[PDB]
Amino acid sequence: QLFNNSRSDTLFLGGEKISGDDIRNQNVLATMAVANVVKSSLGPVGLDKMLVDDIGDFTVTNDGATILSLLDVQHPAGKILVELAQQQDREIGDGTTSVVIIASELLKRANELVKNKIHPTTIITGFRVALREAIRFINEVLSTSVDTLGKETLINIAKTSMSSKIIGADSDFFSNMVVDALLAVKTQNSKGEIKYPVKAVNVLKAHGKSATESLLVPGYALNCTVASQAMPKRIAGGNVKIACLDLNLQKARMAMGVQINIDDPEQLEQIRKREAGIVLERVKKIIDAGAQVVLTTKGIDDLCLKEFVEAKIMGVRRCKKEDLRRIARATGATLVSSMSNLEGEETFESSYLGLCDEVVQAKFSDDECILIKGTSKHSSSSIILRGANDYSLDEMERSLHDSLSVVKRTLESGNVVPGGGCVEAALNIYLDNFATTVGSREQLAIAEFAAALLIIPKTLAVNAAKDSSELVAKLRSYHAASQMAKPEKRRSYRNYGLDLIRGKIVDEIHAGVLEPTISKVKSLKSALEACVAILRIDTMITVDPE
Amino acid sequence: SLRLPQNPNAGLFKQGYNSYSNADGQIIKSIAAIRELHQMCLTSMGPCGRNKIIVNHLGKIIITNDAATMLRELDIVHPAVKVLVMATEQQKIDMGDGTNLVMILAGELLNVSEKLISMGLSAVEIIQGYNMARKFTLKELDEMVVGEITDKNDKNELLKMIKPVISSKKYGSEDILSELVSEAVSHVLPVAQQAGEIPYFNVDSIRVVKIMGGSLSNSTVIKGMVFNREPEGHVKSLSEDKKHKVAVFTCPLDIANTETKGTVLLHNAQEMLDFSKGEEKQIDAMMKEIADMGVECIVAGAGVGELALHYLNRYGILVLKVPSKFELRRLCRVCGATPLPRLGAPTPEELGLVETVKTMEIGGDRVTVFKQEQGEISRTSTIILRGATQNNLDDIERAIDDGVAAVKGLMKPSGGKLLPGAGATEIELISRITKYGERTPGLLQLAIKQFAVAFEVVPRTLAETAGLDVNEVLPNLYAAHNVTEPGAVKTDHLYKGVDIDGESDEGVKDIREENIYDMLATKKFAINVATEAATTVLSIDQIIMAKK
Amino acid sequence: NFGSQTPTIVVLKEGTDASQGKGQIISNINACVAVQEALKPTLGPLGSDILIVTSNQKTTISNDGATILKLLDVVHPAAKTLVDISRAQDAEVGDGTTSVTILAGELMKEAKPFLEEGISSHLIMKGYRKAVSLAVEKINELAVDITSEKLERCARTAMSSKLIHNNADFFVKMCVDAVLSLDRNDLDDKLIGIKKIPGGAMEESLFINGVAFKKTFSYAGFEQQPKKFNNPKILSLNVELELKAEKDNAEVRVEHVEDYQAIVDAEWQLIFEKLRQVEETGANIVLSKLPIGDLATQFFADRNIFCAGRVSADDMNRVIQAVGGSIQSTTSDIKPEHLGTCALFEEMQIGSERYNLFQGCPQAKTCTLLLRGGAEQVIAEVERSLHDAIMIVKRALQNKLIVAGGGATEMEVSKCLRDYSKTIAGKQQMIINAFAKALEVIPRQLCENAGFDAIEILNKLRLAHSKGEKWYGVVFETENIGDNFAKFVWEPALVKINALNSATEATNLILSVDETITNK
Numbered sequence A: 001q002l003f004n005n006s007r008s009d010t011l012f013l014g015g016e017k018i019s020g021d022d023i024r025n026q027n028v029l030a031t032m033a034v035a036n037v038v039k040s041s042l043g044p045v046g047l048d049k050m051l052v053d054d055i056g057d058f059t060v061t062n063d064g065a066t067i068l069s070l071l072d073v074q075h076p077a078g079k080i081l082v083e084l085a086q087q088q089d090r091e092i093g094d095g096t097t098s099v100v101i102i103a104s105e106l107l108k109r110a111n112e113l114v115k116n117k118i119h120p121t122t123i124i125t126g127f128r129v130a131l132r133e134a135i136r137f138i139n140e141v142l143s144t145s146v147d148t149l150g151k152e153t154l155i156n157i158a159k160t161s162m163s164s165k166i167i168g169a170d171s172d173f174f175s176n177m178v179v180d181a182l183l184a185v186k187t188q189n190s191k192g193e194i195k196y197p198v199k200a201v202n203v204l205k206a207h208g209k210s211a212t213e214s215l216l217v218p219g220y221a222l223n224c225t226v227a228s229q230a231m232p233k234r235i236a237g238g239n240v241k242i243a244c245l246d247l248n249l250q251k252a253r254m255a256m257g258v259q260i261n262i263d264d265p266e267q268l269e270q271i272r273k274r275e276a277g278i279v280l281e282r283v284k285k286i287i288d289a290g291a292q293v294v295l296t297t298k299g300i301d302d303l304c305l306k307e308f309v310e311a312k313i314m315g316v317r318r319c320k321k322e323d324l325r326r327i328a329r330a331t332g333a334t335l336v337s338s339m340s341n342l343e344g345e346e347t348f349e350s351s352y353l354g355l356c357d358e359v360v361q362a363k364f365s366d367d368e369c370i371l372i373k374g375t376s377k378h379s380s381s382s383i384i385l386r387g388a389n390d391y392s393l394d395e396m397e398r399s400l401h402d403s404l405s406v407v408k409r410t411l412e413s414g415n416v417v418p419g420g421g422c423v424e425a426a427l428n429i430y431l432d433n434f435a436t437t438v439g440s441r442e443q444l445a446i447a448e449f450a451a452a453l454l455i456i457p458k459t460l461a462v463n464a465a466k467d468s469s470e471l472v473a474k475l476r477s478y479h480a481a482s483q484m485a486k487p488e489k490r491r492s493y494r495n496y497g498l499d500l501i502r503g504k505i506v507d508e509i510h511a512g513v514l515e516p517t518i519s520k521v522k523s524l525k526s527a528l529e530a531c532v533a534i535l536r537i538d539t540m541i542t543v544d545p546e
Numbered sequence B: 001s002l003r004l005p006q007n008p009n010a011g012l013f014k015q016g017y018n019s020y021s022n023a024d025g026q027i028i029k030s031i032a033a034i035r036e037l038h039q040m041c042l043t044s045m046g047p048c049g050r051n052k053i054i055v056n057h058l059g060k061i062i063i064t065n066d067a068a069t070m071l072r073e074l075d076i077v078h079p080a081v082k083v084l085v086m087a088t089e090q091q092k093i094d095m096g097d098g099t100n101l102v103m104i105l106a107g108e109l110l111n112v113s114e115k116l117i118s119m120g121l122s123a124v125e126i127i128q129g130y131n132m133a134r135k136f137t138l139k140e141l142d143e144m145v146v147g148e149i150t151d152k153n154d155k156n157e158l159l160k161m162i163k164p165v166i167s168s169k170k171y172g173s174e175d176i177l178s179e180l181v182s183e184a185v186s187h188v189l190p191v192a193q194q195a196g197e198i199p200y201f202n203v204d205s206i207r208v209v210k211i212m213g214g215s216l217s218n219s220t221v222i223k224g225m226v227f228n229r230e231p232e233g234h235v236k237s238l239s240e241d242k243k244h245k246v247a248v249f250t251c252p253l254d255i256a257n258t259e260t261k262g263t264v265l266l267h268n269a270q271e272m273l274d275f276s277k278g279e280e281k282q283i284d285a286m287m288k289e290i291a292d293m294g295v296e297c298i299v300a301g302a303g304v305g306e307l308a309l310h311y312l313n314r315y316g317i318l319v320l321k322v323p324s325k326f327e328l329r330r331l332c333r334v335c336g337a338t339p340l341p342r343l344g345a346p347t348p349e350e351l352g353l354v355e356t357v358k359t360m361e362i363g364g365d366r367v368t369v370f371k372q373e374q375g376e377i378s379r380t381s382t383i384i385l386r387g388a389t390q391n392n393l394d395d396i397e398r399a400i401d402d403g404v405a406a407v408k409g410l411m412k413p414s415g416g417k418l419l420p421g422a423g424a425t426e427i428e429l430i431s432r433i434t435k436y437g438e439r440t441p442g443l444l445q446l447a448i449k450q451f452a453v454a455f456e457v458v459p460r461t462l463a464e465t466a467g468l469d470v471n472e473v474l475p476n477l478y479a480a481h482n483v484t485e486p487g488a489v490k491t492d493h494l495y496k497g498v499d500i501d502g503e504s505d506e507g508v509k510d511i512r513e514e515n516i517y518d519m520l521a522t523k524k525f526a527i528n529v530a531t532e533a534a535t536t537v538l539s540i541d542q543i544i545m546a547k548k
Numbered sequence C: 001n002f003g004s005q006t007p008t009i010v011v012l013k014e015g016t017d018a019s020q021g022k023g024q025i026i027s028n029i030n031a032c033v034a035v036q037e038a039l040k041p042t043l044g045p046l047g048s049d050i051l052i053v054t055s056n057q058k059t060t061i062s063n064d065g066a067t068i069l070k071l072l073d074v075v076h077p078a079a080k081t082l083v084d085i086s087r088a089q090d091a092e093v094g095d096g097t098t099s100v101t102i103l104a105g106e107l108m109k110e111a112k113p114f115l116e117e118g119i120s121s122h123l124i125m126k127g128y129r130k131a132v133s134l135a136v137e138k139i140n141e142l143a144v145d146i147t148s149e150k151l152e153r154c155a156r157t158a159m160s161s162k163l164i165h166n167n168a169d170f171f172v173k174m175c176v177d178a179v180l181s182l183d184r185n186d187l188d189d190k191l192i193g194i195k196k197i198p199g200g201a202m203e204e205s206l207f208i209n210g211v212a213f214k215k216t217f218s219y220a221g222f223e224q225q226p227k228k229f230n231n232p233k234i235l236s237l238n239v240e241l242e243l244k245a246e247k248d249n250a251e252v253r254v255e256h257v258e259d260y261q262a263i264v265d266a267e268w269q270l271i272f273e274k275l276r277q278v279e280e281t282g283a284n285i286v287l288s289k290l291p292i293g294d295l296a297t298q299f300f301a302d303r304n305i306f307c308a309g310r311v312s313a314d315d316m317n318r319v320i321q322a323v324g325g326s327i328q329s330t331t332s333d334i335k336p337e338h339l340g341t342c343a344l345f346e347e348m349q350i351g352s353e354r355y356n357l358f359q360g361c362p363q364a365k366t367c368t369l370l371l372r373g374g375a376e377q378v379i380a381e382v383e384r385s386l387h388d389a390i391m392i393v394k395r396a397l398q399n400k401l402i403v404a405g406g407g408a409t410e411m412e413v414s415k416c417l418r419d420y421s422k423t424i425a426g427k428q429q430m431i432i433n434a435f436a437k438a439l440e441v442i443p444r445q446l447c448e449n450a451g452f453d454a455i456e457i458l459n460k461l462r463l464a465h466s467k468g469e470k471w472y473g474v475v476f477e478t479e480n481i482g483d484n485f486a487k488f489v490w491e492p493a494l495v496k497i498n499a500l501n502s503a504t505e506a507t508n509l510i511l512s513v514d515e516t517i518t519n520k
């Protein structure tokens, strides 16, 4: 911090050498330097940010998942928090902003314990006994989500994930959208275990009216253009057959290394004809099957387009692999990589075709989308987001994508807990009485671990531009009486948090904000494992590149 | 197509010259340029105001919460911002009180004018609007005045004067800082009750000497003055009573050499023998007439010779150096002596009266003190200001200059004419000026209306700096002035104001019992010069610069 | 309009630093914590020293807060408040500079998380300014009104954390006698002026009842004079004793050649007349600020009269108060009564440098010891250690106040602040308790340098204040904690009052600042 140290005094290293508490201080400032951009983005009162790529392009982002991934940091101690933000997005999909703040403060608050001659091995042991004591207390205080006869255990869950976004005001409209979407795309596996594949719904970047008037599609929406303009755009009538092909349908050459050689020039035209005919024989049998709509991964040549225009078939090129599996899964078809069977003959059976009620191509602000609705075998869903531009919709795309992961977890695990820093304030009262029981040096480690957990409710008040100590002192008073509740419900002074729009302490159950308990579990372990990685480092050895 | 003609007929003037007309939103930019440094003044008005670090190119740092002082060092590019610098500089020179206010108002009048020019009001009508508001503003300040001092010297009355002034600059503790000024003001004033003489007071009388070390509680009020000098011959505690005499000479204590080629000339050995002893006997003979008058300390104006020093410390005459003009003039006012440049006998009527001259250790260096007693009082007293940080000595010293400048406000006008502080004087003008807009017809009513809206910045600033939410504290205070028919006739709703610390809601428990008020003479010229700052910026529609 | 560019008018000059945001005041705190880290391990007797070499290649070694920050040219504006606090305590006291800086550091470091919260700046300053008023009053109760038992113990603690602490058995015996020569209400610091002698060992020093000044010039008749006078007599002069121009001019007209011989003999006549008046009064020692020529020193060399010159005015003022004479800038007005006397005179070889010793006076106002050492930093460290200790025993004579050392003052004040915060007002309970545990940084680092664990110490201090009413503190010898009154460790209270007032003024100065402007 003060000055640079001596460069390899009687050590003979090509790179730099540093040791002592100086690098330990640099890791604290390194974790705090990358955490300051995450501070202002926490809670509903947080504001968004924009990252410029020095080419004019910019992107608005609130969550610290992709912000820290875009910020190219060269200090390796900061890379662990960068990967921690990416790690938490994969498993849980929510709380990337919280683990960076929690992990940074645990290292910041533990920095005072370093110069007290408390070893890091004793500090992490005091943190770990506080962790498993906190997990059991979280397992005591949580609650199942069937919860009540009315739903609204899913309408309220969406508000927590939808808060701190541009469309947080429209969360009342989008709360019904996300719950209706994930209940349509469920599946069955492992003999009774229900799964909810995230990203299976199609998020379209449309422009137009507003985010409030975003129409929920009762079915999947394919984002691709029509091949020819002379084709029929709208196909009515029930039992519309869906064909999902992937083989190469355009005219292709012979095998990858063979050479066509012929002596008799009479058959030179005939081999040209059958190469043009062998590709049309495949299109002939699809017309015999009567598939109104056909989808292909590869291209579609003009030799095939004439047959679809004549027979009124909807041929669409330039489909992707991951989409057609969901089309076949929803419409009831099966993925056809090639047309063949166990016998030597080549044919096409009608069982490979799907079924849907209606297919309509719609265009909105230079965005052609094929609206497939009314799947008979299994339902599907897609959300057409509408806003100002593509870069504003990227925040909405991440806002919706994080909302599916949160609503995924509350259905997989019915246990939930209230927001507003309730459990973060409750663990402090639980750990203070436990810190005195253990006696020896781990009291300060467990105590300072509890003090670091209060940063989540404190940051909600700091970013709100209000008085923070009064809200924290009132939240401290109610949680202080929870441990001394004196059971005989009348077990009140629990399940309360901050209300920032009004600045009062009210019941979070009635306010309608909840979060699954599994997000709290994985966030605490991943935050502490990152804290263990930084505390145990003593000396750095940076080797310059050759 | 690839390149424009790049403004033809531009060679009329130099390439460095640039024009800036009212169009293209440039008047909005000049308001935004004021908004850059105006927000710096928001954190610096009030008792909870925060000082500012200003590192000059030389490295001399001054820490301060005032505006006129901070704007001296900053080199400004925008000319419209320099109007505020010289407007606050005029405020400091004349009255020495109320400069943050000038900036705050002259900046908010340009802020509300941003809305007026955007609506479509012509610039000529804007100046007529504020001028008609100014005549009504200065009229009502004389009407809603309450209280008066009526006594030049009193222990309790000065607490009402000095305390609200120094409360902005380095609040700290109230009693220890206020007593140093109220004690020193009584020493220098020519009281002379029941004589009919004109009062007189000088800003240069009270002066603060900065000494490092100690603490703010150990500060004392010295009757006389002090320098960091060393006696040459000997030091003396001077435990002898029966007061000494003082003789001041502006010329050096040496032989008056010829101005034109003073050179020795010795033709023979008889002159060589007597020339060495002649200088000794001549210097000794001049000291006999000076020594027989009973003088024991002489203040010299320039360098003193060694031969003259040998005969001065023979009889125990103290020597003091004052190598400057103003340092020598300030000392004569204490003892009341009349200097004469001649080396002869001081006149007995012109000899000064000083009882004791002590030399003690305060800041580790040698200092000479000239404390008088209750008998034979003197003027131009000093205040020993002790502190730890030299930067804090600078700002506290200028707070005494602001307090001494506030004492000047009592001499010229007929009396004190105090006003209620803590935003009460600003919030009262909002209702009076708003009613004045309803009485006058014409398109100037919006200018009168926005002039009242600009006065909300004083209660809004004190509520923001006090760590309170302005959305709840401000409209709660309007209820005291929106009210009618309430019991008491002798109405006491005028003393309601903001509060920095304490009760909820905020209307302060009067500014009364609190003993905080404002001066009428400060508010008169502040609103006058603040309106002139907004007048000159709004009246100009084209700006021309050079080299940048 | 006059140009196609139309440049946008910037408010400030080009190159001016940034402005309001998040982290401005935190950078000033971290800047103070950075400077505070360098002075951190230098606390207490079991600390360390700091080696600094500036651009001019001047080596220096020290453990002080004023000297370390003096040589370091600090350009950061908020960090120079520490230079100021240290300088201030040194000036008014000369001891405990570091303590003040570490306390200033921890109050600002403790104010860091409150500034991250929504606490305003004035609320934190009101807590310390209201708490420091009780700390000053509490220290007055901790201090004693001691008058019995008639200096020795106060000097041993002031010499800590530097060289001569281990040699306190020899230096404190003669250092107490330095201030006893000074009478009340004068306390002249220039009389304790001590010089440098490169060469020798510190153990061979001795106490001197007078002055010892370097001649700085080799005269032609220096060896002829005797070095030992049984009953010497000192007379201070100021006239220049050599053949030159008389009074700032030189112009002599001579017409006749017979008078040209007489005017030269007149100059030779008056110069011996000037010297004969010095000879007739019996002045054995002659001293003058101005130079003395070879003509005068050889005239004095014949009849056993020592002389010297090339001395400063500060040295001359110390000679008068030692011998008790006066200054006479004229040879004709010399009388016998104004001549000073002493017991004996002897010029001794000290580090390849000659010094004129005076000693054995019945009443001497001067104490001046020769500092001999190996390196130039050894003699410098012995000077600064004595200069810090001499101020403590100096001001101990001004007032008799004694408080317990070893970090005992901070713990007793902190306990009452915790009781005062427990009672009233709610909001400031966190601030005062934060000031309480932040005030305990002095015994915190004092034991970390000793190698002991801080948890076992700090838990023992709090729970044992009931029987350890006021004199409860740390003991380094027995590796235990006990009463300091039995160990005879004492320290005045003036270091404690000026430390808290300077530290409270230092932290409150920049806590009322949220800006940083740097032109050019």
Ligand SMILES: Nc1ncnc2c1ncn2[C@@H]1O[C@H](COP(=O)(O)OP(=O)(O)O)[C@@H](O)[C@H]1O
Pocket: A041, A042, A043, A044, A062, A063, A094, A095, A096, A097, A098, A159, A160, A161, A162, A163, A164, A402, A418, A419, A420, A421, A497, A498, A499, A500, A513
């Ligand atoms: N309406 C609300 N009221 C109070 N606290 C809330 C509210 N919405 C969210 N929070 C708090 O914000 C924290 C993180 O919110 P999150 O939705 O993860 O933000 P982001 O989407 O930016 O990651 C949660 O721990 C929760 O307690």
Ligand SMILES: Nc1ncnc2c1ncn2[C@@H]1O[C@H](COP(=O)(O)OP(=O)(O)O)[C@@H](O)[C@H]1O
Pocket: B045, B046, B047, B066, B097, B098, B099, B100, B101, B164, B165, B166, B167, B168, B169, B402, B420, B421, B422, B423, B498, B499, B500, B516, B517, B518
């Ligand atoms: N303790 C206090 N309580 C209420 N109001 C105060 C207090 N101290 C100062 N004020 C108000 O704050 C205003 C600040 O005036 P200011 O322009 O800073 O004076 P100065 O010209 O000395 O800088 C004053 O007019 C006064 O009414």
Ligand SMILES: Nc1ncnc2c1ncn2[C@@H]1O[C@H](COP(=O)(O)OP(=O)(O)O)[C@@H](O)[C@H]1O
Pocket: C042, C043, C044, C045, C063, C064, C065, C095, C096, C097, C098, C099, C156, C157, C158, C159, C160, C161, C405, C406, C407, C408, C442, C474, C476, C489
């Ligand atoms: N003999 C001693 N026993 C215990 N503590 C001591 C002793 N001498 C000094 N101290 C402690 O050392 C601290 C610092 O004093 P000192 O070393 O004189 O100055 P500095 O603050 O510059 O290090 C004091 O707070 C005092 O309590």
Ligand SMILES: [Mg+2]
Pocket: A094, A095, A160, A161, A162, A402
């Ligand atoms: Mg979220």
Ligand SMILES: [Mg+2]
Pocket: B097, B098, B164, B165, B166, B168
């Ligand atoms: Mg004022």
Ligand SMILES: [Mg+2]
Pocket: C095, C096, C097, C158, C160, C161, C388
């Ligand atoms: Mg010391």
